[PDB]
Amino acid sequence: GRCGLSHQCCFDISSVLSSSQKLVELDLSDNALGDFGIRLLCVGLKHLLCNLQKLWLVSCCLTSACCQDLALVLSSNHSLTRLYIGENALGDSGVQVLCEKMKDPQCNLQKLGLVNSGLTSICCSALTSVLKTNQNFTHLYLRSNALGDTGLRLLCEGLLHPDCKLQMLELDNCSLTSHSCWNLSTILTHNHSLRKLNLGNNDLGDLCVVTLCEVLKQQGCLLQSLQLGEMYLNRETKRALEALQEEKPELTIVFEISW
């Protein structure tokens, strides 16, 4: 991670990923594995039978032009189930590939960190497809992404598929109308989809957290936690939020903004 590294390692590590029967995770972080070395990586992964568990391509300066190969190796292998691609240089136009990674069950990809993407609508539509179809898809770490209200709306529409087991989820950056959060809370009430959630730099307004605290107040939607940061909202929101946890510890915590 962050090591002085380049494309050359790719074939090498592919070779050892083939010949290794002991490695279970391998991290490639902040290292200039630009592209086509991701191809060498994926061919090394799929060609033999390897007991790989994690695979981190975080901040590796790749593009969508290798995501198809990532999907191929993900389909072929089943040992790999934890695939961070964290906020590298991809986004839209990989969206069809993003979906067809998990277009069927038995993919076995528990967590899937995501990227600073581009056009929200199509990628979040692929996310809805994976959420409604794929089993054991425990996390979806969309973070610092230009995702819109329509995007997250169709995301909760993806949550509308019941029996979809999706644990901890996150929507970091967005600008929504304060009914969308109401839809996600109500859909959690309808079915205990996830456990916690984060809202980061989301400009949501007082009424947003007001609806949030009411819906959690009456048989709370989520069951574990919720994290809110960096708002300058008025303080009767704080009074309502500080009230509700002591009567109901179901919402174990809301991350207090500053006070």
Residues at the site binding its own copies, with contacts judged by CB under 8 A: 7-8, 11, 36, 39-40, 65
- Identify which of residues 36 and 183 has a Cβ nearer to its own copies in the complex: 36
Buried-exposed string 35-49: b where 16+ CB fall within 10 A, e elsewhere? bebbbbbbbbbbeee
Residues in the chain: 259
Element (H, E) at 27: strand 25-27
Q: Rounded to an integer, what distance in angstroms lies between the CA atom of residue 103 and that of residue 91?
A: 18
- Identify which of residues 65 and 207 has a Cβ nearer to its own copies in the complex: 65
Shortest distance, CB of residue 161 to its own copies, whole angstroms? 32
Q: What share of the chain is helix, strand, coil (3-state, %, to 5)?
A: 40, 10, 50
- Identify which of residues 5 and 188 has a Cβ nearer to its own copies in the complex: 5
- Phi, psi (deg, nearest 5) at residue 61: -75, 75
Shortest distance, CB of residue 54 to its own copies, whole angstroms? 25
Find, among 91, 29, 92, 39, the residue nearest to 59 by Cα. Answer: 29
Shortest distance, CB of residue 86 to its own copies, whole angstroms? 25
Shortest distance, CB of residue 151 to its own copies, whole angstroms? 26
Cβ pair 174, 144 in contact under 8 A: no
- Identify which of residues 60 and 152 has a Cβ nearer to its own copies in the complex: 60
Distances (CA, A) of 208 to 16, 134, 157, 183: 51, 31, 19, 11
- Identify which of residues 7 and 111 has a Cβ nearer to its own copies in the complex: 7
Shortest distance, CB of residue 11 to its own copies, whole angstroms? 7
